Amino acid sequence: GAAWACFRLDGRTLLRVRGPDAAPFLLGLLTNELPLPSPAAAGAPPAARAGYAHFLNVQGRTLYDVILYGLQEHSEVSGFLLECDSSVQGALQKHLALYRIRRKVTVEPHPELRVWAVLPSSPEACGAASLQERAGAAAILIRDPRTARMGWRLLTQDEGPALVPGGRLGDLWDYHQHRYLQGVPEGVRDLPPGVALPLESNLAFMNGVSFTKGCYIGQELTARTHHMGVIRKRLFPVRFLDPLPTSGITPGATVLTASGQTVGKFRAGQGNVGLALLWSEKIKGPLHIRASEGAQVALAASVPDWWP
Template sequence: MCLVSWLGAGASACPRASCLSPGRLPGYAEEASGFFLECDSSVLGALQKHLALYKIRRKVTMEPRPELRVWAVLPNSPQADQTAPLQERAEATAILTRDPRTACMGWRLLTQEEGPALLPRAQLGDLQDYHTHRYQQGIPEGVRDLPPGVALPLESNLAFMNGVSFTKGCYIGQELTTRTHHMGVIRKRLLPVRLTGLLPAGGVGPGTAVLTASGQAAGKFRAGQGNVGLALLRLETIKGPLHIRISESDQVAVTASVPGWWPVATK
């Protein structure tokens, strides 16, 4: 059994699919070839403008596809086998593929139809289910979790999620990213955290300091939902008690964890 959530308009990580460049999707005719890029809808215009800078004189068309819906197909429980009941497919009306980031994020369904109608054994969820699941798994998504100019690829664990290529030719930031990956030490990483205590009515704000028991800076809270979220933390501090000060006299305990899907060498 799977849980399906439509990532619809207005969400902080609301994707829209855009045909960006020549290529071929599995099962599609050559004349209809292209790539679909899922992105945060709040930056769709900015992304199109940015990619247009690199089109130069190529015959490439980029256009939004608002008629397409993107659904997340998630396991009902972390222990459920999310791969056995489904098979990848590309048809005239739908594309079903494994989420390229990590297996614990299940599948992505791109279609103009209603998602549950295509997966009759699925239960309809909502965006809160989806975001809670990915925060628990430590998966950042969209500009809220990965603010442009602030989030670094390696600290955000994008190399673990097929988000960084170390074999592709030059791209902006490629030299520094590759050198750090092969020779450097990554001292801070974006980690899933759980908050324990009385939270402010509006939640914990982005950039709020996370402190050690002695009051030393351990990192910063990035984003979250309810009592789960993501924080950029110094790895040397995560085994000790951490907290966020809510007021002069109140604080919220912060418990960080290392996701099970991370490569073993980094745990």
């Protein structure tokens, strides 16, 4: 009966990045350009713009996946909101401190607003039930910048369904199940800090990287990989076709073909779905992971429909 499902993302938190130098400061640490809302004309309606990016380490590997919210109030830039994994709020705050030393910028946690995801309950069908972009103080409702398949982001001090018409509370299992089925990585389990490579994490397919931009931490290796050739290994949505063990699948379990050749590695999942870093060329033929006897468990790799 409900058109939208509202998920409170406890695994996600916000940081407020303000000051007159918040933009050049964040630009040198992120993979993308900043979501700067268009300059307000004639009057002053409060606006918000969303962007996706990763904070990389010096060796060009993903540290944190972040959703950026460019804030505008009274025709002027209000600052920025950084949405990161709850478990790496501190590490990110320390990483930002390590580079803020010489500039006019303030980084502080923003517990005032909570992270929510708004997904359309109707699969394939569009609206309506149409949703309108909301901004300013108390609440922000904006399209997920990664893909339309990820619905909307709701930043609010209140409850999700209270603002969303035809919205109902969602079971957090269904949100993570939706991400794994769509091949959407999010968080430290899907993107291990200092292990996951951004382009292999599908950062370009998710509007998270700019190649027409100035210098940033890990730019050199990123640019090189993007230009030298086709990304040979990618995170792909996987689904298990055989019963899983009591413990589950080990976070780095080898993906094998019928002959025993290592074609990939299980990353993370939930239930019978997840992501695996696989050699794109070897995703058709029958795949499996070792369990107890030596042959079980069977796995199926898929190509997300929202990818180019």
